[PDB]
Amino acid sequence: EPAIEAFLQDGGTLAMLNDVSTDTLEQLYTLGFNQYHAGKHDEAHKIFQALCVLDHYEARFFLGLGACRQALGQFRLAIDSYSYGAMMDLQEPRFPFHAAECLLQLGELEGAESGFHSAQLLAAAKPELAELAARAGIMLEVVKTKKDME
Amino acid sequence: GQGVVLPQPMQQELDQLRKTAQLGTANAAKLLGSSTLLNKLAFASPEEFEIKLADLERIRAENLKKIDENQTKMKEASEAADKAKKSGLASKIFGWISAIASMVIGAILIATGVGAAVGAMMIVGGAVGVANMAIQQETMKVLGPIMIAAEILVAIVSIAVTFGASAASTAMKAVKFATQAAD
């Protein structure tokens, strides 16, 4: 038991524990990714839940989890997943961005602002991502202005 | 779902793998249809277990790369949170972060990979996640914090089941102290 704990603590995952291969996990990501794009959001959510449990350090399983939740209108729960995902990949702008969208839908402007603002910075830094950087900039304005008319 | 751009990737075995992964929370829900209680225990455990090291060392060695990466993620997350709470730019780049996730950072400071584990468990939702989703109409909302506690508690059990019960115990301590650090 203390061996399992030390494993877990040092950063081992359930995948490792059950000798689950990188390629089996990828298969399951693919299934989840297709289902999400098929609009089968509820089913995609269940897949991403399994992935997040199998490897609880992969930001993109948390991105997927969060995207399913947002599509189902579960905005609060999506912010939770986008938040944990960010912590696993601090340079990824999609996390604060889609969390901000979710925050705006709930009327939380101060945090929507924070999200769109970080999403812009992080997206700016990478030049592959200027379109998203711009969207973030726009929504940032939309939020600041919706904030002023309160 | 055309809202989020997920990164691009790269039939009955996948249902095996999904059952594997939900196995811990399935057993968790099962064991929590009783009268346990605690609930409000007297130093958590024994628990119970009721109902091999060379392998672990092989596995560990086989995945030195990923394990180090995961350690780095936790290190970089801890640091990011450290440098954010010193500076006045705490709630400017991280004000969007939810309260749950915020505790999970705390749990990671107290218990590293065990903190992350239980934290991810809470966020994944698993057992009472479907109820929680349903709870989205309806009144004020002290219903919120308790659904957390519910989730925390289920996650602890799930950890107990899936990994050590010392792991669950540490996870409880982690959540405890991340919760006090939160005030």
Q: Determine the structural domain holding residue B32 and report its residue range.
A: 1-183
Say if residues B126 and B25 touch (Cβ distance below 8 Å): yes
Mark yes or no for CB contact B104/A28 under 8 Å: no
Alpha helices, DSSP H, located in chain A: 2-10, 14-17, 22-37, 41-54, 59-71, 75-88, 94-105, 109-125, 130-148
* Contact: B120, A98; criterion CB under 8 Å: no
**Is A32 annotated as a binding-site member?**
no
* Mutation for testing the A interface, residue in B4, B49, B118 having most A CBs under 10 Å: B4
Calpha distance A122→A125 (Å, rounded): 5
Domain covering A1-150 in this structure, CATH number: 1.25.40.10
- Please indicate if the annotation marks A64 as binding a ligand: no
DSSP class of residue A90 equals: T
b/e code B36-71 from CB counts within 10 Å (16+ = b): eeeeeeeebeebeeeeeeeebeebbeebeebbeebe
> Hey, is the C-beta of A89 within 8 angstroms of any chain B C-beta?
yes
The experimental method behind these coordinates is X-ray
Burial of B21 (0-12, 13-18, 19+ CB in 10 A): buried
Domain-wise residue ranges, chain A: 1-150
Partner-chain contact B14 A54, CB within 8 Å: no
Q: What resolution, expressed in A, was reported for this entry?
A: 2.7
φ/ψ bin of A105: left (φ > 0), alpha (ψ from -120 to 50), beta (otherwise)? alpha
Closest chain A residue by Cα to residue B69? A11
Cβ contacts of B104 on chain A, cutoff 8 Å: 84, 87
Do you find a cis peptide bond into A108, omega within 30 degrees of 0?
Answer: no
Nearest to A10 among B98, B113, B121 (CB): B113
Residue of B nearest to A102 (CA): B96
Residue A127 CA to residue B43 CA, distance in Å, equals 53
Does the beta-carbon distance from A53 to B126 stay under 8 Å?
yes
Phi, psi angle pair for B112, to nearest 5°: 35, -120
d(CA A44, CA A122): 27
Q: Which candidate from B9, B56, B125 shows the least CB-CB separation from A29?
A: B9
- For B80, which of A80, A90, A99 is closest by C-beta distance? A90
In B, minimum Cα distance to A44 occurs at B1
Residue with tokens 């711009």: A134
Check the annotation: does A12 bind a ligand.
Answer: yes
Residue A82 and residue B101 in contact, taking contact as beta carbons nearer than 8 Å: no
What is the C-alpha separation between A90 and A110, in angstroms, rounded?
20
Contact A80, B151 (CB under 8 A): no
Interface of B with A in 135-164 (CB under 8 A): 136, 162-164
Euclidean distance between CA atoms A113 and A132, whole angstroms = 15
- Give the H/E segment covering residue B154: helix B143-162
Under 8 Å between Cβ of B153 and B145: no
A99 shares contact with chain B (CB less than 8 Å): yes
Pair B36, B154: CB distance under 8 Å = no
DSSP symbols for A54-84:
H-TT-HHHHHHHHHHHHHTT-HHHHHHHHHH
Assigned token pair, B14: 């996948």
Helix (H) or strand (E) holding B69: helix B64-86
Q: Is B111 on the interface with A (CB under 8 A)?
A: yes
